[PDB]
Design a protein around this ligand. Structure first.
Ligand code: FAD
Ligand code: HEC
Ligand code: HEC
Ligand code: HEC
Ligand code: HEC
Ligand code: FUM
Length: 560
């Protein structure tokens, strides 16, 4: 392992700040400074490469030490989701065992009384889009902030985002000739959420849309290419130009701005208990290398995101998903909720767990909803259609579940390819089957040529505005310019629509007292009610930004 290979050289000193050893802080700045001092930084390393582990889509600072582990085997962090078989010096397999947020209670108790280390105004749990947005906002005229993230690298699931941030009206929308209006936001959002959605939440989720999409814009963002997500009417999923992805893009831009203002962002730092006056007094942090510690603060924003990814827990409410795969990063296991619950928060819609119908087994990645939206059709093992490809996720997950072998085949054109640039990434991942003709495509895929061809020729007829098979309301492109591609895909646990109960100010309500627990804030996937029973594609990112901002600001006035 790497620190022995380097003990052989110069000592403990090489990396650590002292000759006895040990880490100063959990972001591991010193040591990573040491790394780069002898080896160069990531751009330097990246330039040297001929798929390289030193240059990727991850956002934010990506410590050397997030892969190159000192005192233990090392693993590319890319293996949490891909299987690149890189040949990592001092290699190891990626393994994560979920450990309870409450275990080691004695230890936590012993350490709560044992001093009082730092104090700040506002603490924010998690670094995805909601926590960063909150960072900007608390910081941005108001308070001192100290955001913790448990992962070794930032941006949660936010950074994987693919297809768009919903907003209504007055976003750039103007400039493309997309005619849309606020109530249509609300109204689809209720319809997709099967009408249980907290009405006041879906309201500000409608009415702050444009501003969050302008805020992003005041910060550096590129929200201009618009498309169609399953479930809405007027086109409104904002993204970067030509079909790239908004998650990385948004995460990055709010990472920068949060860092730019004075946020004190700390990785390998998991919050394991909110501190009880019953007012929120502070937080108990388990810094991975520096041990436990208390931070006193006046407001706590909870922005830890969802629990998709914990199959134990998700199987708990919907055992249909036991054994299913997830589209999330490793961090979404519910720590947040647990922390909050211990604090006596109220939750809702915990059992409504959204599976994404088009994940790819082979690639270990989601494959965006926009591929079907720009024109792809889905095809079972027999070579035929079985569904209106732009239906709701739950219906589309259901239908592929009910098909030969539990999986199905996205099938598109050279025309759909060109038109949605996320598709170059899939191509880059070796997961896309190619055919110079549909008969060629079939052979790769192991689906019958005359049936697939008849399917595709017929689909084309439907394309002529009428799907006399499955009702697909939009038929964007014809599927007739070669080469032709396909991917097999299947449903994967993806979003948890439920969560902590909060108002339009982002306050968290107590189960017992049905009022807010004081100075306890929340925003993002960790919260409940914004999406009802079903989340619309494109509503997560807009919920996260607009609610973060509110959570931040609310927490800032508190303490002020
Ligand atoms: C593959 C994929 C594609 C999606 N694409 C889209 C899209 O195109 N459009 C859209 O609207 N939505 C999309 N979604 C929905 C969007 O991703 C939200 O679901 C996600 O943004 C949630 O934001 P967040 O701020 O709440 O959390 P996250 O981005 O997950 O941020 C999470 C932080 O909390 C850290 N954390 C958790 N617990 C603790 C703790 N106890 N202490 C410290 N840190 C902690 C976590 O590990 C995590 O990093 C997508 C999600 C995925 C996974
Ligand atoms: C001389 C033999 C060394 C002593 C004593 C210690 N180290 Fe290290 N170290 C390095 C990293 C990247 C870390 C972070 C965690 C990890 O990646 O393993 C650490 C951490 C420690 C710790 C904490 C133990 C724990 O894992 O919880 C101790 C006690 C420690 N270090 C003491 C990096 C390096 C390194 C660079 C390659 C060298 C030469 C050493 N460490 C050597 C020593
Ligand atoms: C910070 C914690 C790090 C990390 C992540 C790495 N180094 Fe070093 N390194 C140095 C020298 C002179 C060598 C040897 C070259 C050789 O023997 O051919 C290395 C080796 C490595 C590797 C190489 C694995 C391989 O053999 O391919 C890796 C992955 C690596 N390091 C990472 C020099 C230095 C330092 C100068 C004092 C410092 C500081 C570090 N390394 C710290 C780090
Ligand atoms: C995970 C995403 C990584 C991060 C972040 C960093 N490194 Fe890396 N490193 C990683 C792998 C999987 C490999 C080897 C496999 C391959 O195909 O490249 C490496 C290799 C190195 C090396 C040896 C190669 C070289 O050009 O010398 C060194 C010296 C190295 N890595 C150092 C290093 C530093 C300083 C980093 C911070 C900027 C860093 N790595 C980031 C995985 C990952
Ligand atoms: C899980 C959270 C991931 C980790 C960690 C890494 N990647 Fe990833 N990667 C992930 C997804 C969900 C996607 C697809 C996004 C989409 O647009 O639908 C990707 C994409 C890639 C690609 C192809 C697209 C591109 O932008 O090049 C490559 C080549 C890739 N990822 C490589 C890669 C590397 C090298 C990573 C380590 C630094 C890495 N990924 C981390 C999911 C996740
Ligand atoms: O781009 C997609 O298909 C997913 C969107 C979401 O989860 O909101």
């Amino acid at each position: 392992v790497l620190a022995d290979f380097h003990g052989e050289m110069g000592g403990c000193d090489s990396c650590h700040v002292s000759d006895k050893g040990g880490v100063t802080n959990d972001n591991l700045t010193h040591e990573n400074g040491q790394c780069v001092s002898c080896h160069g930084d990531l751009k330097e390393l990246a330039a040297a490469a001929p798929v390289s582990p030193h240059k990727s889509h991850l956002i934010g600072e990506i410590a050397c030490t997030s892969c190159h582990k000192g005192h233990e085997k090392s693993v590319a962090y890319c293996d949490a989701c891909h299987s690149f078989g890189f040949d990592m010096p001092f290699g190891g397999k990626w393994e994560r065992k979920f450990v309870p947020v409450d275990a080691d209670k004695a230890a936590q108790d012993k350490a709560i009384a044992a001093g009082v280390k730092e104090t700040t105004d506002v603490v924010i749990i998690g670094s995805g889009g909601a926590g960063l947005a909150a960072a900007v906002s608390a910081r941005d005229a108001g308070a001192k902030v100290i955001l913790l993230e448990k992962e070794p690298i930032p941006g949660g699931n936010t950074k994987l985002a693919a297809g768009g941030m919903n907003a209504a009206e007055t976003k750039p929308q103007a400039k493309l000739g997309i005619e849309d209006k606020k109530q249509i936001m609300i109204d689809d959002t209720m319809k997709g959420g099967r009408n249980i959605n907290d009405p006041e939440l879906v309201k500000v989720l409608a009415n702050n849309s444009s501003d969050s999409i302008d805020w992003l814009t005041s910060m550096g963002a590129d929200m201009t290419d618009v498309g169609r997500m399953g479930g809405a009417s007027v086109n409104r999923s904002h993204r970067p130009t030509g079909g790239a992805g908004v998650g990385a893009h948004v995460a990055q831009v709010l990472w920068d701005n949060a860092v730019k203002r004075g946020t004190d962002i700390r990785l390998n730092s998991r919050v394991v208990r909110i501190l009880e006056d019953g007012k929120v007094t502070g937080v108990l942090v388990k810094g991975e290398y520096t041990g436990y510690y208390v931070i006193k603060a006046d407001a706590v924003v909870i922005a830890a995101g969802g629990f998709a990814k914990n199959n134990e827990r998700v199987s708990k409410y919907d055992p249909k998903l036991k054994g299913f795969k997830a589209t999330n990063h490793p961090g979404a296991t519910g720590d947040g909720l647990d922390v909050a619950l211990q604090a006596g928060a109220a939750t809702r819609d915990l059992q409504y767990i959204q599976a994404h119908p088009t994940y790819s087994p082979a690639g270990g990645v989601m494959i965006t909803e926009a591929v079907r939206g720009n024109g792809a059709i889905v095809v079972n093992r027999e070579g035929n259609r079985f569904m209106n490809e732009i239906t709701t996720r739950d219906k589309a997950s259901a239908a592929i579940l009910q098909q030969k072998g539990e999986s199905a085949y996205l099938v598109f054109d050279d025309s759909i390819r060109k038109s949605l640039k996320a598709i170059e990434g899939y191509v880059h991942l070796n997961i896309v089957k190619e055919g110079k003709t549909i008969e060629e495509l079939a052979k790769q895929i192991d689906v019958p040529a005359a049936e697939l061809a008849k399917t595709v020729t017929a689909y084309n007829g439907f394309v002529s505005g009428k799907d006399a098979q499955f009702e697909r309301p939009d038929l964007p492109r014809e599927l007739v310019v070669a080469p032709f591609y396909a991917l097999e895909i299947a449903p994967a646990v993806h979003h948890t629509m439920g969560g902590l109960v909060i108002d339009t100010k982002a306050e968290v309500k107590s189960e017992k007292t049905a009022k807010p627990i004081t100075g306890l804030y929340a925003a993002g996937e960790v919260t409940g009610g914004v999406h009802g029973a079903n989340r619309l594609g494109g509503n997560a990112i807009s919920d996260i930004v607009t609610y973060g901002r509110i959570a931040g600001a609310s927490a800032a006035k508190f303490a002020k």
